[PDB]
Assembly symmetry: D2
Homo-oligomer: 281 residues x 4
């Protein structure tokens, strides 16, 4: 039997990166998946962002990978900011798949890059709306289905090392990610009575398009004209106690899997770094 | 002679409660004050709140108390959500008083009271807008004046025990107050280069109208028909290691004063509970 | 293929309880075991302790269980306080089993029960010597074998909820268990360069003879003449967010297994509660 | 009126450095002092230490400074490891001065410098005995006098940044200093009933002979033949968010004074860094 055999997991930001990885790993271990992603640029008139937008095709690819593990998947192209649309998608996914046992609130963005005193209200607001309020909305949408099932469940919120410590030029993201720790604790204290566990994962740098993009390469290596990942690697590695530059999506997925599984049945309220020792520094 | 002699402090939520106490204590110790408060109900059409709104007269009373210590005060009736209006008020205050050395981001609200899965988006959004984004706006408005002075300075953010641990029916407030810890850390890492310190205070229950109101008395003591503070005291006391029911505004002001003063010149990045040992439980 | 297939784990306190469970779970998942336990009363002339001593037969039983999973086990009856004897036992175990990949520093005691200001130096010293210095000695004995292997490895220290928060009448234990968090961090920063991860587990109450003994029953339920586990259960449950009285040894072993496995290859420096939400309170 | 007018403070490690500063600062603010220090080398046959020993004359110099503030002082040359001697000294001090309101458990050492896997049991044991068990003994000796006074009180334990995070080659010290956080929490939960507050201070580098010695200069600047403090400054500064190389004893004393004073009457259970932002990194 797989470690989440017979369960259903709702994963946001599932089009690519960590969210894709979570969908696929959970499916490998026996779960069917409700996979949602915006699949559009975050800001309507704007495609020229450092972090590229995801596409409908990215989400279709996630679906094909999940089906390759002989599991079912319901996909929906929906913005976690649009609560009514998100709730409709989750409602339909639970109709189709029969239950909801696991929530992985993974969807998130980067924007901005100014000091916090020079950050625009537009960048601030978008950041809070997705990375904090969107996580709230994700749990709010899924949890009535988990409660009604009467079997308990497991909720994993994606924070960051930035939910535990700060770094210059990321302050709006740090505020949001710290707020996610509050959501984890608040939901944990309210939902424990239903044998629902709530925990957060805190990745260091992860090899996804959020990290590996031209804008980010240039920010980490302003001394170079056309830096790539190999140029950024030694700078990222300085943040770690283990001598690696970043973790992989599978590393985060393996933590999510642990929390989702019955092997972590009595683990709730925890902030778990998957950070190669960043938080020891 | 005073511990903040010759300094100027910008205090939000100064109409009453802790913010009034901060303004008066800092003035007692030699600071002039830029005091801001919304001075009206939080939600335009709405006075049916458990926590009563502040008034213009409340802020005028604070001003009289500050003047009683032979210090100057500039007051403004402004909502911390309205960044342009807040910035204009602070700009005018610094014109009048000559400098800005201390920021105390104290303004905050309570609302709601449902479980977090049942919290309205209206209540959520108002809470984040004031208790998280309002604190960000407060620092953003004040800090250019502190940087430009070239003398360093001290920024104190008011979080809560709720910014460190959760309690049922307060989850949106907990998310905001945890976000405030992120703001503290983020501003701390960015502003240290200017010899600006950033720290947060985390009160337990404080005797102000935010705690002492009819709605709250009845909520803490549903067994009584007309409960007052004496009836709520033993319930609040159960949260503490020291056998007291709540701290007073002066207790929070004394911590603010410590952080504002040169006696805390090299203290930055700290989360300081004034909590009667709540966080030991 | 087991999650620790082909590895060797060194587990202290392996005669019963959590340590036995760790040996057996790790064996089930493919590891051979170096299992050590004092197998005698902690204090030479003294058998009438609240927590009963382990016996040689207890350790023989652990061995039979590991062999039942078709794995190899080397046992040794040794006190973790006797560094030279412990080192000799580990040296022999590694000779026999070929490598050392995982260290589980699980041996521990309770004693005392007075307030910390009334705790005897005898009780203090024994507590520190086993629960803090014995953990240090365990890692010190095993890690040269792990380093010399050149394959990286994983070290798990057993702390407690008492390594993160205090409770009356357990203060010497709390000091030791907080010291264990220091050892985890210190070894983590030093050993990361070898791709050796170091983490700590923090159990709430666990159903082992350390919890389930006549002395402890009477302490939790002084109102009863002959209390048993059922009488203690509701008191223990008040410490938790999930409505359970205690976790089982397997719950701790499943966390140890996660950290020991390649699925946690980049997780280091973490304090992981398996505490049913005790640390949310 | 001084901020600790009419109080008596018991300070260990009072011969020089931070302890001297605490004694003098508390005296300046109106407290009489029971000042203890070993005033001898730590290890009987041994003066070849990087950190120089204190002397009886150092303690006499502290006493002269306290008397210069027109306060009384009782001095004793006593090792905090010798509980019976320490208790006898405190008992006599309280006879002479009439009460005990404040305890400052400041005495501490450095030794060793190997990795934790290569640290001798001699160095380990001395470190735990003084920096952990010595702190326990200090509170144990003083606190009955505080309890019996019936006026409440304040206990400050000196930990370190090393009680919150680790650094290579300091692991035994880190274990002890983390244990001190456990003592603080344990005493906090037990003594709150008596209106006794317990808190810890966590200095970064402090300009005392523990930091400023030949051995340490050479260790921080192996590239130089005869390095002094000016050469060590930029290396220490790299650990901080504020651009300073170290704090001064007065900075720690100002935090001790705050906690000792009625201005911190409801503050208990807190870990307070005076660290120039080290813990933000
Ligand atoms: N990549 C890193 O280094 C790193 C480090 C720490 C934490 N994180 C966090 O991990 C999580 C996953 O990020 P990732 O690395 O996979 O990045 P990613 O950008 O590859 O994936 C994020 C996915 O979320 C989706 N998304 C964003 N906003 C959305 C919205 N409003 N509604 C629905 N979907 C939305 C995106 O379209 C994208 O497909 C995020 O919360 C991120 O903040 C990332
Ligand atoms: N009272 C408690 O028990 C308690 C406990 C922990 C933390 N806190 C926090 O302490 C701080 C002070 O609260 P208090 O106890 O003095 O309560 P209070 O309600 O007496 O005072 C808060 C003041 O903030 C003002 N304010 C609210 N929203 C505003 C806005 N948008 N713009 C400008 N001013 C605004 C109010 O008008 C009021 O005068 C708040 O951040 C609160 O969350 C309070
Ligand atoms: N049982 C609980 O509720 C609980 C809660 C939190 C943490 N812990 C910790 O979990 C760990 C395991 O305890 P357990 O619950 O399995 O209790 P247990 O008493 O059943 O098992 C502990 C084992 O450690 C062995 N041991 C003790 N001192 C030793 C020494 N000097 N040298 C070698 N072996 C020695 C004992 O003989 C015993 O076999 C301990 O570190 C304990 O402090 C236990
Ligand atoms: N100096 C730093 O950079 C630094 C940084 C963090 C924490 N600390 C801590 O601050 C405290 C004060 O150290 P300091 O900087 O003033 O150093 P210091 O060496 O100048 O002073 C420490 C004093 O403690 C005394 N002492 C040591 N062992 C003793 C014992 N067994 N009994 C009685 N007295 C004893 C010494 O004789 C000395 O007078 C210590 O706990 C230390 O670990 C220091």
């Amino acid at each position: 039997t797989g470690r989440v055999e017979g369960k259903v997991a709702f994963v946001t930001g599932a089009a690519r990166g960590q969210g894709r990885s979570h969908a696929v790993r959970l499916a490998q271990e026996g779960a069917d998946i409700i996979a949602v992603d915006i699949c559009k640029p975050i800001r309507a008139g704007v495609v020229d962002t450092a972090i590229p937008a995801s596409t409908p095709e990215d989400l279709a690819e996630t679906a094909d990978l999940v089906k390759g593990h002989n599991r079912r998947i319901v996909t929906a192209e929906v913005d976690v900011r649009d609560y009514d649309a998100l709730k409709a998608a989750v409602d339909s996914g639970v109709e189709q798949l029969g239950r909801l046992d696991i929530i992985v609130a993974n969807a998130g963005i980067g924007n901005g890059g100014d000091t916090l005193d020079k950050t625009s209200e537009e960048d601030w607001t978008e950041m809070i709306d997705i990375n904090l309020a969107g996580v709230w909305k994700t749990v709010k949408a899924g949890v009535p289905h988990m409660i009604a099932g009467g079997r308990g469940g497991s909720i994993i919120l994606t924070s960051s090392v930035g939910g535990l410590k700060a770094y210059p030029h990321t302050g709006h993201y740090v505020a949001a990610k710290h707020g996610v720790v509050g959501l984890m604790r608040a939901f944990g204290v309210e939902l424990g009575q239903h044998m629902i566990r709530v925990n957060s994962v805190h990745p260091t740098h992860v090899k996804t398009p959020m990290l590996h993009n031209e804008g980010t390469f240039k920010m980490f290596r302003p001394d170079l004209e056309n830096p790539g990942p190999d140029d950024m690697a030694p700078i990222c590695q300085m943040f770690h106690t283990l001598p690696i530059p970043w973790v992989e999506p599978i590393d985060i997925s393996n933590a999510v899997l642990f929390f989702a599984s019955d092997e972590a049945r009595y683990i709730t309220g925890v902030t778990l770094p998957i950070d190669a020792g960043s938080c020891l520094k």
